[PDB]
Design a protein around this ligand. Structure first.
Ligand SMILES: CCCCCCCCCCCCCCCCCC(=O)OC[C@H](COP(=O)([O-])OCC(O)COP(=O)([O-])OC[C@@H](COC(=O)CCCCCCCCCCCCCCCCC)OC(=O)CCCCCCCCCCCCCCCCC)OC(=O)CCCCCCCCCCCCCCCCC
Ligand SMILES: COC1=C(OC)C(=O)C(C/C=C(/C)CC/C=C(/C)CC/C=C(/C)CC/C=C(\C)CC/C=C(\C)CC/C=C(\C)CC/C=C(/C)CC/C=C(/C)CC/C=C(/C)CCC=C(C)C)=C(C)C1=O
Ligand SMILES: CCCCCCCC/C=C\CCCCCCCC(=O)OC[C@H](COP(=O)(O)OCCN)OC(=O)CCCCCCC/C=C\CCCCCCCC
Ligand SMILES: CCCCCCCC/C=C\CCCCCCCC(=O)OC[C@H](COP(=O)(O)OCCN)OC(=O)CCCCCCC/C=C\CCCCCCCC
Ligand SMILES: CCCCCCCC/C=C\CCCCCCCC(=O)O[C@H](COC(=O)CCCCCCC/C=C/CCCCCCCC)COP(=O)(O)OCCN
Lengths: 318, 71
């Protein structure tokens, strides 16, 4: 019965990723005065299936100079980690109920960077290497401030349990209490998912295909699926953390509908942002995250430690 | 032997064509936006204060039930 739950989680997520590819193409097309996919299937509804079937029937290449073991391990790690980061999300009930869900997401996301690191190194080509060192720099840029923002926001939750976030925001969204932290968190999640304007690792104009330039076919497809699953997962985490849906214990379907709508809106905002802006230089991302975000985050952390004590508004569950 | 017919501009002249930059101001002042943000923050703080105190009372009640059941 638990395996049925695992499958009912992981298969719909892959289908959502497949159709998010089409939705992104159509949103970008219509923001660019064109249409996007509308031929293969009514309204391009069969385009993701054609893409997947073309990729998995295409020859996979193992580079002559590459390390083969790491070259094959990296996409497996990427996809499995992207699938695993979904299990503690309460929708309104989680698949795996943890005391410290937030720390689990933190650790698994910080493990996910080694997929890019090891694929870029194991390709044994120059553009892949440049992509990998850009990944190193990006993680160094965003990690500390991301963690401090999470701590500051959760100081009103009372714990690290994700389900407590539903009862914390029973009356008001957490975005009305910490909107500067919400802004910094949104930019941090854009940087954490290698999304425009922070899509430095791929670096398409600058680095051809970057870290995954050597990759082709099915192995290449796995990287794409992992990235888009990460997009959806991070936006769902943001929706749970800042726009809290109201949960009726006798009707969880209403909560599920509302939460799915909110995360879809955040994902569409990601696509909008990609369509609207140019790319950062990767030293400029580090300067932004270390000279503007970090001091404000430290000050707001001090403020959010002090405020519940001053106002006698400390949450329960020591 | 009719009149010469050639592509030409119309009698009098064509309408004037705009070319200068046009970027309207289209925004509120900084004071208004800062005030709205601070007001939202204060409203959220006060609502959170009420809710957290209620939650503390509920936790005390549940702990008392556990204390009653312990022996
Ligand atoms: C006793 C226990 C022994 C443990 C063995 C470890 C498992 C590896 C065994 C098979 C790998 C070797 C095959 C090979 O080299 O090419 C084959 C063959 C040869 O190719 P070739 O072109 O003819 O020549 C290549 C050259 O020989 C040159 O080829 P190369 O340059 O690629 O050789 C490098 C390779 C060759 O290996 C060696 O040199 C010796 C092997 C000993 C490695 C053990 C070091 C200890 C590392 C830490 C502990 C790991 C777990 C061990 C415990 C096992 C019990 C659970 O070394 C490695 O890459 C080691 C990687 C394995 C570690 C996997 C860990 C996953 C990390 C995920 C994140 C962790 C999260 C937190 C937890 O090519 C292929 O068939 C395709 C590639 C095969 C890859 C399959 C998947 C990767 C390996 C399975 C990992 C299992 C994880 C569970
Ligand atoms: C500005 O130009 C660009 C675009 O715009 C035109 C892009 O789209 C774009 C992105 C590339 C696109 C062409 C999208 C390509 C679509 C994927 C690579 C295909 C992936 C789809 C599957 C692998 C998903 C999984 C397959 C199943 C059908 C899902 C279910 C899984 C089973 C196990 C069940 C880039 C990089 C770009 O540069
Ligand atoms: C279907 C037929 C089954 C055949 C099994 C063969 C398996 C094998 O090792 O062969 C290597 C095979 C074929 O290569 P070629 O010989 O060049 O082409 C074959 C076409 N004639 O290459 C592969 O595809 C390797 C597949 C990957 C191995 C799968 C297991 C890897 C385990 C990874 C563990 C680590 C995971 C990391 C993330 C987890 C951390 C939480
Ligand atoms: C990679 C590292 C995996 C980390 C898994 C962490 C899972 C987790 O945090 O859940 C904790 C969960 C519940 O704890 P609480 O939430 O505090 O409350 C429970 C009591 N009511 O604890 C557990 O379920 C423990 C179960 C086993 C522990 C995990 C063991 C996994 C180790 C992975 C080793 C990798 C395999 C070996 C090779 C690696 C690379 C080839
Ligand atoms: C009564 C007690 C209250 C205590 C005080 C509380 C009020 C505090 C008010 C200030 C809060 C401001 C928070 C803003 C944090 C960042 C501000 C900032 O300065 O960052 C910018 C940089 O920020 C950015 O430009 C973002 C870059 C990425 C942009 C990507 C697209 C933009 C995002 C679209 C909308 C995002 C919506 C966020 C929230 C979403 C919902 C969660 C600095 O960059 P520069 O202008 O170059 O100058 C620095 C050196 N002089």
């Amino acid at each position: 019965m638990f395996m049925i739950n695992i499958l009912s989680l992981i298969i719909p997520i892959l289908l959502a990723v497949a159709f998010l590819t089409l939705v992104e193409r159509k949103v970008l097309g219509y923001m660019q005065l064109r249409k996007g996919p509308n031929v293969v299937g009514p309204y391009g509804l069969l385009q993701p299936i054609a893409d997947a079937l073309k990729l998995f029937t295409k020859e996979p290449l193992r580079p002559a100079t590459s390390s083969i073991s790491m070259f094959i391990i990296a996409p497996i790690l990427a996809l499995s980690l992207a699938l695993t980061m979904w299990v503690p999300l309460p929708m309104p009930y989680p698949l795996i109920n943890m005391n410290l869900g937030v720390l689990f997401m933190l650790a698994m996301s910080s493990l996910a960077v080694y997929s890019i690191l090891w694929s870029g190194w194991a390709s044994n080509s120059k553009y892949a290497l440049i992509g990998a060192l850009r990944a190193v720099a990006q993680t160094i840029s965003y990690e500390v401030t991301l963690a401090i923002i999470l701590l500051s926001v959760l100081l009103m939750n009372g714990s690290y349990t994700l389900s407590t976030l539903i009862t914390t925001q029973e009356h008001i969204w957490m975005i009305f209490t910490s909107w500067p932290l919400a802004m910094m968190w949104f930019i941090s999640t854009l940087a954490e998912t290698n999304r425009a304007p922070f899509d430095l690792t791929e670096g398409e104009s600058e680095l051809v295909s970057g870290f995954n330039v050597e990759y082709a076919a099915g192995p290449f497809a796995m990287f794409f699926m992992a990235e888009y699953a990460n997009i959806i997962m991070m936006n769902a985490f943001t929706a749970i953390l800042f726009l809290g849906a109201s949960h009726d214990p006798h009707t969880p379907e209403l909560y599920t509908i509302n939460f799915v709508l909110k995360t879809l809106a955040l994902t569409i905002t990601f696509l909008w942002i990609r369509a609207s802006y140019p790319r950062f230089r990767y030293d400029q991302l580090m300067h932004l995250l270390w000279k503007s975000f970090l001091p404000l985050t430290l000050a707001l952390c001090m403020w959010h430690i002090s405020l519940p004590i001053m106002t006698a508004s400390i949450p329960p569950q020591s | 032997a009719s009149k010469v017919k050639q592509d030409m501009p119309p009698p009098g002249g064509y309408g004037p064509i705009d070319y200068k930059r046009n970027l309207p101001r289209r925004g509120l002042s900084g004071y208004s936006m800062f005030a709205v943000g601070i007001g939202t923050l204060l409203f959220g703080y006060w609502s959170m204060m009420k809710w957290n105190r209620e939650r503390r009372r509920l936790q005390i009640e549940d702990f008392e039930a556990r204390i009653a059941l312990m022996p």
